[PDB]
Amino acid sequence: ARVQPVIVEPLAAGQGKAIKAIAGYSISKWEASSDAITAKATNAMSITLPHELSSEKNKELKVGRVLLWLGLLPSVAGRIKACVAEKQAQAEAAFQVALAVADSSKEVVAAMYTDAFRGATLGDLLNLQIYLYASEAVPAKAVVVHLEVEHVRPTFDDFFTPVYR
Amino acid sequence: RVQPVIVEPLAAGQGKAIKAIAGYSISKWEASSDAITAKATNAMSITLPHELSSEKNKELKVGRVLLWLGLLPSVAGRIKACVAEKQAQAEAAFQVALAVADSSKEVVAAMYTDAFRGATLGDLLNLQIYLYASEAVPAKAVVVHLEVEHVRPTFDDFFTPVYR
Amino acid sequence: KAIKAIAGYSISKWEASSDAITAKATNAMSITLPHELSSEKNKELKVGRVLLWLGLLPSVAGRIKACVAEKQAQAEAAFQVALAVADSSKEVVAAMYTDAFRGATLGDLLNLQIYLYASEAVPAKAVVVHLEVEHVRPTFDDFFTPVYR
Amino acid sequence: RVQPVIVEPLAAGQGKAIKAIAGYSISKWEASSDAITAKATNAMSITLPHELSSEKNKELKVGRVLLWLGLLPSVAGRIKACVAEKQAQAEAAFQVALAVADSSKEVVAAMYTDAFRGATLGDLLNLQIYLYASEAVPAKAVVVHLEVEHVRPTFDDFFTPVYR
Amino acid sequence: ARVQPVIVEPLAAGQGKAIKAIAGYSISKWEASSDAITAKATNAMSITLPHELSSEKNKELKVGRVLLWLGLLPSVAGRIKACVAEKQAQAEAAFQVALAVADSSKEVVAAMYTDAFRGATLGDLLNLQIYLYASEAVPAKAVVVHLEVEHVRPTFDDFFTPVYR
Amino acid sequence: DSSKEVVAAMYTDAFRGATLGDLLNLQIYLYASEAVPAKAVVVHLEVEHVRPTFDDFFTPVYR
Structure with missing residues (x-):
């Protein structure tokens, strides 16, 4: 019945292991700026x-795995949720099958779909569609949905182009 | 196994001294700001x-870079800060922001242990920290200290040769 | 057959559509x-290595040629000092120079501009240069940004 | 024995870098002066x-302390300088002076490798360098650089704990 | 208490070890001819x-290290000093921070900045600016400021140019 | 030539074993088909040669 004690230092923001891609897989980042959205509408x-x-x-x-995460303009008071999904017929219905979902209210603001993509083709994601929702009315540009993802290495990028070789 | 354990509740300033990786050095300097209106940046x-x-x-x-900022106690509301390059749209830096400090969060800091590795100090010039305020605040009420590792110059160990 | 990237590095591509061009003027x-x-x-x-080659909307006649050097007063002398030169006239439109930019910061590339020269004018966006730069792969390779952004 | 030998004639700035004894550090700082009349100090x-x-x-x-001083080239005549405590009679410091630098002498410096050992920096405050001029000279025409060894503070190696 | 004797032969001018570049570093020489200068002005x-x-x-x-040295027209009677420095706001002030300084009056006439450059980029020296000063009025062309310097080897000069290879 | 797709001309053969001092005793030529204004053309020699023993280092400081 040992009674181990323990200091619990809060981390400063930005500190952390910050994950690691499993080998043979190259990460790739990019963006998708928002439309203006009316309140409650998704x-x-x-x-x-x-x-x-x-x-x-x-x-x-x-x-391999997708790490959606979501910045904000530095003044949107309300909760703002988001996730990716199918080609859903009702945007609200899409959250009802979300495996994971980003939220302003939960300290960190990051979805990470560890599973439900490994290992679909990268090409099909064009069929897939992100979704978002907001309590406050939000003007355009205001939200910007980062999303990391990775692939097997695009091994044959490495060569230049021929002509004139 | 099931184990018992007992929480450390522990005083401000007790957090242990992170030390910069060996062969390096630190340059702390003040950076006062001014004015800063109602919501503008x-x-x-x-x-x-x-x-x-x-x-x-x-x-x-x-190497690593840090940015804690000591608010003057007499400020209402929330303020946040960030470090990124001169976007023409001043609020927009928060979108691309790697990490941001916030008053309401219990600790105000924003280490960027990745982000800036291998950067020359000369290019640290063309880098501008931003600010934001949930409220109007009096000028010089916020003083973003920051410090960077920078590799120690050979300069500090020697007297100049006397012929000057 | 094709030229492999140097083993330590990784190539990256882009586009740079050019503005409208007057005949003779550059x-x-x-x-x-x-x-x-x-x-x-x-x-x-x-x-390291760097090369550009430039597609043309096919409906454009006449010589065009491009070069790369830092800005200077004449804006039409850079061809004299240019280390190689793309052209439509040769059977291969490409121009490349493995030599000239070994050992250079990409930040240095900011301090230089490319040039064009029609023999006779063509409408805007008709020409689009393609840089294709070799460079050291980022340590940004790494992985996902830490989730506490 | 009789031996031959051959003189080194050798360029300014070639004098080898004296290094401060180990575990130490150096603090170089400028010190402009002003006015300074015909013969007064x-x-x-x-x-x-x-x-x-x-x-x-x-x-x-x-530890050791040094004081070279870079005259602006456009000065006629001789000037000298010294480091000693606030005598009321300002010229009199040269009497008690431990070592003094001089323009006409080929090298302008005045190391005090003894003199100040074990001194606290706090007491280095109440210490005033003097000056003297053989001629009237325009203000800010003389800038006594000096630097001291001072033992390196533990301060430079660490980030502050983040709770500020 | 040995009492060693010693002949002290003066060297003839031009004799000497004349220094050596540390390996991997290629020296390079060049010039910068003077403007006419009025007396005392710097x-x-x-x-x-x-x-x-x-x-x-x-x-x-x-x-690696810079060896400024300074020739003259063979008849300038006065002292003539020089050194390199920052982008100084007062040319006289620049000598006040000179680490070393060339002078006509000191037998040899050579600065050698053993330190305060190693190892800055070669490119930044364009920001840096030489300075000079003279007692006598001096006509144009009269002074010519040599300066040696060296770099890490510009290893990739060695190849010619392509086209037509 | 301008006419060939490659304007370059080179000759690894012709000047092996020659003093650079010998290069003084020769001149290059041009020939337009029709006239062009001055400075329009700029030749670039690119000569190989033995590296100088001037490699060495700094000139002795007693100049």
Whole structure:
């Protein structure tokens, strides 16, 4: 019946292990700026592949895990939720099947879909659609949905282009 | 196994001294700001102390960087701060922001232990911390201390040769 | 067959659509690093090989040629000092120079602009240069940004 | 034995870097002066840089101390300088002076490798360098650099604990 | 208590060890001809990089040590001092922070900044500015400020140029 | 030539074993088909040669 004591230092923000990609997989980051949204209404947005990866080479890689996370303009008072999903027929219904969901209210603001993508093709995500919801009325540009993702290494990017070789 | 354990509740300033990785050094300097209105975002430039001004000195790799900020006690509401390059849209830095400090959160700091590795101090010039306020606040009520690792210059150990 | 990237590094591509061009007259285009690489962390990587080649909307006749050098007064002498030169006239439109920019910061690339020269004018957006720069892979390779953003 | 040997004639700035004895550090700082008339002696006070102002810092043993001074080229005649405590008779410091620098002498410096050992920086405050001039000279034409060993404070190696 | 004797032969001018660059570093020499200067006034001059090294390749090497030295027209009676420094706001003030300074009056006439450059980029020296001062009035061309310097080896000069390879 | 797709011309053969001092005893030539204004053309020699023993280091300071 040992009674181990323990100091519990709060971390300063930004400190942390900050995860690690499993080997053979290259991470890739990009953005999707928001539409203006009316209060309570749940606007939805297409994922758009980066032009870097818009090529039909890499459309058939394999996603490993997605780390959506969400910045804000530095003054939106209300809760603002978001997640990705199917091509849902009712935007509110989409949250009802969300495996995980970002929220302003939960200290950290990060979804991480450890599972429900591994290992679908990268190309199909264009079928998939992010969603978001907000209590406060929010003006355009105000929210910006980062999303990390990674693939198997796009191994054949490395060569330049031919002509004139 | 099931184990008992007992929480440490522990006093301010007790947090143990993080030490910069070996062969390095630290440069703490003040950075006062001004005015800053109701909701708008001030965008003060950063500036190295003159000890760092020597042209030899300017090209050293930065390591880790930190930014805690001591609010004057007499401020209502929330303020936040961030470090990123000169976007024309001053609020927009928070979107691209790597980490941000906040008053209401129990600790006000924003270490960027990645973010700036390998950066030359010379390019740390063209970097501007921003600010934001939930309220109108009196000028010079916020003083973003920050300090960077910068590799120690060979300069500190020697007297100058006497022929000057 | 194709030229492999140097083993320590990783190539990255972009686009740089040019403005409208007057006949005989020439005009600078600034390089602008793509959003990702602009970062202060990032704009201190070393650079090796670099090459550009430029597509044309096919409906344009006449010589056009491009070069890369730092800005100077004439804005039409840079061809004299240019280390290589893209052209439509040669069967290969490409121009490349493995030599000239070994050992350079990408941040240095900001201090130079590319040039064009039609023999006779073409409408805007008709020409689009493609830089294709080699550089050291980012330590940004790493992984996901820590979730406490 | 009789031996041949051959003189080194050697360029300014070639004199090898004296290094302060181990475990120490150096604090170089400027010290401009003013006015200074025909034969009279100005008596400027010395003042530590704010990095040294921290109250922890003020109590460290000094080691060696040096004082070279860069005359602006456009000065006629001779000038000299010295470091000693506030005698009421300002010229009189040269009498008690331990070592003095001089323009006409080929090298302008005045190390005091003894003299100040074990001195606290706090008492280095109440110490005033003097000046003297063989001629009238325009103000701010003489800038006594000096630097002291002072033992390195533990301060430079650590980030502050984040709770501020 | 040995009493060693010793002949002290004066060297003839030009004799001497004449220093040596530390390995991996290639020395490079060049010039900067003077403006006419009025007496007592302290004219200042831009360092201008040689066109050989004006290229943005080698702007980011690392200077090792600079050996300014100064020839004269063979009849300038007065003292003539010089040194390099910052972008100073008062040319006289610049000598007040000179680590070392050339002088006509000290037998040899050579500055050698063993320290305060190692190891800044070669490119930044364009920010730096030489200075000079003279008692006698001096006509143009009369003074010419040599300066040695060296870099890490500009290793990739060695290849020619492509086209047509 | 301008006419060939590559304007370069080079000759690894012709000047092996030659003093640079010998290069003084020769001149380059041009030939427009039709006239062009001055400074429009700029040749670039690019000569290989043995590295100087001037490599050495700093000139002795007693100049």
